[PDB]
Design an enzyme around this catalytic site. Structure first.
Site, PDB file in Angstrom:
ATOM      1  N   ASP A  37       6.886  -0.338  29.038  1.00 55.10           N
ATOM      2  CA  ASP A  37       6.634   1.115  29.506  1.00 55.10           C
ATOM      3  C   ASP A  37       7.099   1.414  31.094  1.00 55.10           C
ATOM      4  O   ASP A  37       6.074   1.023  31.332  1.00 55.10           O
ATOM      5  CB  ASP A  37       4.950   1.429  28.551  1.00 55.10           C
ATOM      6  CG  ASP A  37       5.283   2.245  29.029  1.00 55.10           C
ATOM      7  OD1 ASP A  37       5.765   3.631  29.531  1.00 55.10           O
ATOM      8  OD2 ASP A  37       3.474   2.504  28.675  1.00 55.10           O
ATOM      9  N   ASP A 221      10.374   7.765  31.676  1.00 53.50           N
ATOM     10  CA  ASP A 221       9.579   7.206  30.517  1.00 53.50           C
ATOM     11  C   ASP A 221       9.824   6.367  29.118  1.00 53.50           C
ATOM     12  O   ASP A 221       9.931   7.127  28.366  1.00 53.50           O
ATOM     13  CB  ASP A 221       8.675   7.924  30.578  1.00 53.50           C
ATOM     14  CG  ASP A 221       7.131   7.151  29.978  1.00 53.50           C
ATOM     15  OD1 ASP A 221       7.541   6.057  29.797  1.00 53.50           O
ATOM     16  OD2 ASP A 221       6.599   7.587  29.235  1.00 53.50           O
TER      17      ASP A 221
END
Ligand SMILES: C[C@@]1(c2cc(NC(=O)c3ccc(Cl)cn3)ccc2F)C[C@@H]2C[C@@H]2C(N)=N1
Ligand code: NA
Ligand code: NA
Length: 372
Positions: A37, A221
């Site tokens: 992440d 992201d």
């Protein structure tokens, strides 16, 4: 530098559930699959027998664990997690041959966090300390890695969208992309923040004030599926996407991600859907470059062949999630405060169109595009 055969293909996942890497924590090492992440900064792992989890961190079994005697409560818009902070030894079996002492949030309670039927049990936040919880004094995993080893301060991601890819820790693998890398500055080290300076639908400019594109930030992201766009930009973008594809009609709910659309197998009409291009601030004054993705990236398969439209409106700014990243090899060049893009050697395309990274373009007033 340039070749890391051991780290190639170290990512796995299932459509809709993100990309995870195998990690080990503690001594003796406990193997865990961990979501990659770039949109958060905590190393956080299930530490208690939640029913969705294949396994979890059992601190009592590790001799190397050290309690920080400190908790952390982390709410998100969707759900939450709570945990106890500590440090322990961490390795990445298909990564560098090193072992580091890293902060770990041992998650003791969570809600709408873990995915039922996913094969991952924690999250590796690869962004900066600034957004770490509870505060910037909790050193993120990648900072610890670079402080404690000889691993260079960068990583790269090839997300191939059942799904898989590569995370190259400490370098770049030239086999993973074609053509050249183009770099955009990391505007500020908190999220991987960048600046979009122009947006095109099928080569047609939205002609919005470019500040709108970065309202209130644009980030890269890997922990988000969608390409998220600020509301006002989203409105213009769908308006233009609907028009480009008006050869067919779809319910308004579809464009709002409120219903799926389905086609008879092998008959998805890719060609009616436009390409989407983002021009990003270049390394040089008045120089930009652009990245182009296909309907293959923004039309997500769900399991007729049913698809979800994965461009969505946002109140948190632009998010370049898996929809963007699946098209490209992405280099998080932390040492040089920049992010590189190149056409991914593994990206999904057809015989007519491919993803593209093209430059240089001349773009003026690019510094005005950043929201303050
Ligand atoms: C930590 C956080 C997060 C991501 C996830 N990510 C995913 O489930 C996921 C799903 C599909 C993809 Cl392609 C990527 N990630 C799950 C929980 C969670 F809290 C919170 C906010 C969604 C933002 C993010 N990047 N990470
Ligand atoms: Na170092
Ligand atoms: Na190459």
């Amino acid at each position: 530098r340039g070749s890391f055969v051991e780290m190639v293909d170290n990512l796995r996942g299932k459509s809709g559930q993100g990309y995870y890497v195998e990690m080990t924590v503690g001594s003796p090492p406990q193997t865990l699959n961990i979501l990659v992440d770039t949109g958060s900064s905590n190393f956080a792992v299930g530490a208690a027998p939640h029913p969705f989890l294949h396994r979890y961190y059992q601190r009592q079994l590790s001799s190397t664990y050290r309690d920080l005697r400190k908790g952390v409560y982390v709410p998100y818009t969707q759900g939450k997690w709570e945990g106890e902070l500590g440090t322990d030894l961490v390795s990445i079996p298909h990564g560098p041959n090193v072992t580091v002492r890293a902060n770990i949030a041992a998650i003791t309670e969570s809600d709408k966090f873990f995915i039922n039927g996913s094969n991952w049990e924690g999250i590796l936040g690869l962004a900066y300390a600034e957004i770490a919880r509870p505060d910037d004094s909790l050193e993120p995993f990648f900072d610890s890695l670079v402080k404690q080893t000889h691993v260079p301060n960068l990583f790269s991601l090839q997300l191939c969208g059942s799904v898989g890819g590569s995370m190259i820790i400490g370098g770049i693998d030239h086999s993973l992309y074609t053509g050249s890398l183009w770099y955009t500055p990391i505007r500020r080290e908190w999220y991987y923040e960048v600046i979009i300076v122009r947006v095109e639908i099928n080569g047609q400019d939205l002609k919005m004030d470019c500040k709108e594109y970065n309202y209130d930030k644009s980030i890269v992201d890997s922990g988000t599926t969608n390409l998220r766009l600020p509301k006002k930009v989203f409105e213009a973008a769908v308006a233009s996407i609907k028009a480009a594809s008006s050869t067919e009609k779809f319910p308004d709910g579809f464009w709002l991600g409120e219903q799926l659309v389905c086609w008879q197998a092998g008959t998805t009409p890719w060609n009616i859907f436009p390409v989407i291009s983002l021009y990003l601030m270049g390394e040089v004054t008045n120089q930009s470059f652009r990245i182009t993705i296909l309907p293959q990236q923004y039309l997500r398969p769900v399991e007729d062949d049913c698809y979800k439209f994965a461009i969505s409106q946002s109140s948190t700014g632009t998010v370049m999630g898996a929809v963007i990243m699946e098209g490209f090899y992405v280099v998080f060049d932390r040492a040089r405060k920049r992010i590189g893009f190149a056409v991914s050697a593994c990206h999904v395309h057809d015989e007519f169109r491919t993803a593209a990274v093209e430059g240089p373009f001349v773009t003026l007033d690019m510094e005005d595009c950043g929201y303050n």
